[PDB]
Amino acid sequence: AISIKTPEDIEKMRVAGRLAAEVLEMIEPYVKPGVSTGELDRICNDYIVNEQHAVSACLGYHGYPKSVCISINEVVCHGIPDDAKLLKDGDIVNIDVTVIKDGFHGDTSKMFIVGKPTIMGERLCRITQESLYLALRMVKPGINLREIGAAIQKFVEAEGFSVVREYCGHGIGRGFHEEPQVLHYDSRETNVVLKPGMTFTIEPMVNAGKKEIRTMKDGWTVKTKDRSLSAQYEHTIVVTDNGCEILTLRKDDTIPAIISH
Numbered sequence: 001a002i003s004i005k006t007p008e009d010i011e012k013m014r015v016a017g018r019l020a021a022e023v024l025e026m027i028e029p030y031v032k033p034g035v036s037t038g039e040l041d042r043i044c045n046d047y048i049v050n051e052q053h054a055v056s057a058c059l060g061y062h063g064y065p066k067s068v069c070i071s072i073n074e075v076v077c078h079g080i081p082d083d084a085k086l087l088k089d090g091d092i093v094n095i096d097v098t099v100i101k102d103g104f105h106g107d108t109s110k111m112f113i114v115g116k117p118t119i120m121g122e123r124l125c126r127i128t129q130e131s132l133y134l135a136l137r138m139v140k141p142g143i144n145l146r147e148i149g150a151a152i153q154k155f156v157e158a159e160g161f162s163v164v165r166e167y168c169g170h171g172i173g174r175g176f177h178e179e180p181q182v183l184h185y186d187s188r189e190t191n192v193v194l195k196p197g198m199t200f201t202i203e204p205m206v207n208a209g210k211k212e213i214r215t216m217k218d219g220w221t222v223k224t225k226d227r228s229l230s231a232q233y234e235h236t237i238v239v240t241d242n243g244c245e246i247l248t249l250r251k252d253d254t255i256p257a258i259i260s261h
């Protein structure tokens with residue numbers, strides 16, 4: 001049973017969402033060749049705790065060891081920050097942030113292109129973000145999640161890319177992952193009609209190559225089976241009366257915070 005949020009709770013979601021977004025805005029300057037994913041994590045955690053007076057929702061979740069997930073190139077998600085893993089020219093990197101503030105969660109992520117961008121890493125990130133934007137434009141009461149998943153997949157595959165099946169968007173509030181599940185592809189199992197007040201995430205994972213993925217033996221790191229590049233972008237939203245409001249919008253986003261139909 002999916003739950004609706006109250007006006008007060010939604011305001012708290014705006015705050016946690018903004019904080020999540022601001023972590024990504026803060027870290028951007030440090031995302032350069034030579035930096036380790038470990039340092040970036042410590043920077044993010046220090047900021048979340050000492051500046052935002054919030055806490056990382058990832059730290060300890062199901063035993064997660066770090067504060068943010070950092071995934072590079074062929075790594076699909078849940079990449080673990082490490083003091084020896086350095087970023088280099090050409091790399092595409094996702095920093096996945098989740099913060100809890102005043103009891104509510106804010107969840108978002110984006111891609112960063114390191115050094116000189118390559119046409120393909122550049123193209124994969126742009127298409128991935130557009131697939132998120134396209135889905136965000138469909139959000140309004142009355143529409144079924146299945147349609148949104150359908151549209152993301154059709155857009156993505158038309159570009160020669162593939163949509164990761166194992167992971168999905170999700171309801172969010174006082175809990176990290178609440179109902180419903182938000183698939184980024186068409187599924188006969190999906191039947192959820194949006195309603196005002198619902199809060200969830202949209203976070204498509206797109207592979208340049210095949211959809212198949214393999215988990216590493218650290219029990220967390222997920223890579224593409226064919227070792228092709230993978231990209232992801234995420235935003236937390238609240239369904240409004242005639243559309244939705246992006247709670248994790250950043251200065252660099254090129255979509256309106258409030259989407260009115």
Ligand SMILES: NNC(=O)c1ccc(-c2ccccc2Cl)o1
Nearest residue numbers: 058061062064069096107203234
């Ligand atoms: N958008 N990112 C997420 O929803 C997310 C980040 C980390 C996790 C996670 C999922 C299952 C178990 C442990 C973690 Cl930290 O989910």
Ligand SMILES: [Mn+2]
Nearest residue numbers: 107201203234
């Ligand atoms: Mn999420």
Ligand code: NA
Nearest residue numbers: 072073075230
């Ligand atoms: Na990746």
